[PDB]
């Protein structure tokens, strides 16, 4: 049962440091190295460096030199990765992985082989923000945006931190035609999302539509009745 288990998610402000651990089991830890790869939201994979467990040698990506440090504790079969002077573009899921190469004496051939065992990943969010409740604004339909028997209405859940936010409509009495979009992390370090309903035109004047936004991290619940625009 070979596997690598990483530490829990982290939220840091710019300038701080983060240290992620990677516990190994099921194999002789000292016969292999540990590689680190990160992945920004919606982006590809990005190599950070590797460390050999036996000799402690390292090789870091040039873009992180002087900013990253990798260590190993052979007595606990754990590798560590420390990234300093954190900036907002360090927001990513960080993975540890084992290159499938048994070091025979020369450790620097470790990075030449495929990584066959991967950790589960560690989310690291870098943001200057603290806990902040969302602002909810209506996305109301008008007589011009409503040509046929179906109209679109929703709520904009703006500038909250951190995740998650749950949105329901009419306390769960309305689920058909509802879509809640994934949140986007903005350059401000805050999240925003939207949720919409496609609804029959005949019910607009007499049926109430209410977005129920719950943000447990800030102890906030907001109910916003979305009515059509006057135009």
């Amino acid at each position: 049962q070979v596997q690598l288990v990483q530490s829990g998610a982290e939220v840091k402000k710019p300038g701080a440091s983060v240290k992620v651990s990677c516990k190994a089991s099921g194999y002789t830890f000292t016969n292999y190295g540990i590689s680190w790869v990160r992945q920004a939201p919606g982006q590809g994979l990005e190599w950070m460096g590797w460390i050999s467990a036996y000799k402690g040698n390292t090789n870091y990506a040039q873009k992180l030199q002087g900013r990253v440090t990798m260590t190993t504790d052979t007595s606990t079969s754990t590798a560590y990765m420390e990234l300093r002077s954190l900036r907002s573009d360090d927001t990513a899921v960080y993975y540890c992985a084992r290159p499938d190469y048994q070091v025979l004496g020369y450790d620097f051939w470790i990075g030449y082989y495929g990584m066959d065992v991967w950790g589960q990943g560690t989310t690291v969010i870098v943001s200057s923000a603290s806990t902040k409740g969302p602002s909810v604004f209506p996305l109301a339909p008008s007589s011009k945006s409503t040509s046929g028997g179906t109209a679109a209405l929703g709520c904009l859940v703006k500038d909250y931190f951190p995740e998650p936010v749950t949105v329901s409509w009419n306390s769960g009495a309305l689920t058909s035609g509802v879509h809640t979009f994934p949140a986007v992390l903005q350059s401000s370090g805050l999240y925003s999302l939207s949720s919409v309903v496609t609804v029959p035109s005949s019910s607009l004047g007499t049926q109430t539509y209410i977005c129920n936004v719950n943000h447990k991290p800030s102890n906030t619940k907001v109910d916003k009745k979305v009515e059509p625009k006057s135009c």
Binding site: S35, V37, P41, G42, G44, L45, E46, W47, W50, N59, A61, Q62, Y95, A97, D100, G111, Y112, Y113, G114, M115, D116, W118, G119, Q120, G121, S135, F137, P138, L139, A140, S142, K144, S145, A152, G154, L156, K158, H179, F181, P182, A183, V184, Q186, S187, S192, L193, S194, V196, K229, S230, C231
Partner: protein, 216 residues
């Protein structure tokens, strides 16, 4: 990324698809091995091919790899639905000495015909303008495959700041939905004649427009 992969490939179930991976004289052109990884949405990558052509024990024989002097290729024969994932090639680069990846390729196993996105653009609400903020909301639904490009325009000019777009996410009907936001100043919103979000899907562009002088 240092290695170049196609942004997306697609195929019907049972068909055979290939994902190419080109580099330069300092990586693949230098004779370095190429490895391939599969990443399901939300999970860690999984090694598919190592040493150009070798399959690890447990990986289905549907996957295979090859390498020339300039490029590498991952071949997937007999497409299954479970193969819908992102695929990365990985190699080594010798410079004045790092691991390098390709940009990733999104493989779509086509389970339905192509669908152009439905686009609903929302002007800033009156309530938001009272908060000295202004956000245009471009909502994109019912497109397949799940890949769109979103551009914004102010009057006839391109918008290059204040744009945030979400990665597409599946609806119930196996189609995909996405959203884009243009954060603006109330003065910026009211001083221009119109704003537009342009969504490109499979080379075709859908453009919706709103204007402060025409309530909608």
């Amino acid at each position: 990324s240092v290695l170049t992969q196609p942004p997306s490939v697609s195929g019907a179930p049972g068909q055979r698809v290939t994902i190419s991976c080109t580099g330069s004289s300092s990586n693949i052109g230098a004779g370095y091995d190429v490895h391939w990884y599969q990443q399901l949405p939300g999970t860690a990558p999984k090694l598919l091919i190592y040493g150009n052509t070798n399959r690890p024990s447990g990986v289905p024989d549907r996957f295979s790899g090859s390498k020339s002097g300039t490029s590498a290729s991952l071949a997937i024969t007999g497409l299954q639905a479970e193969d819908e994932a992102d695929y990365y090639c990985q190699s080594y680069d010798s410079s004045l000495s790092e691991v390098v990846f390709g940009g990733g390729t999104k493989l779509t196993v086509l389970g339905q015909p192509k669908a152009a996105p439905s686009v609903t653009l929302f002007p800033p609400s009156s309530e938001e303008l009272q908060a000295n903020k202004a956000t245009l909301v471009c909502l994109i639904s019912d497109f397949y495959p799940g890949a769109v490009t979103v551009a914004w325009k102010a009057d006839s000019s391109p918008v290059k700041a204040g744009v945030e777009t979400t990665t597409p996410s599946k609806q119930s009907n196996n189609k995909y939905a996405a959203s884009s936001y243009l954060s603006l100043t109330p003065e910026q919103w009211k001083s221009h004649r119109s704003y537009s979000c342009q969504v490109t899907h499979e080379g075709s562009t859908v453009e919706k427009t709103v204007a402060p002088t025409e309530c909608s």
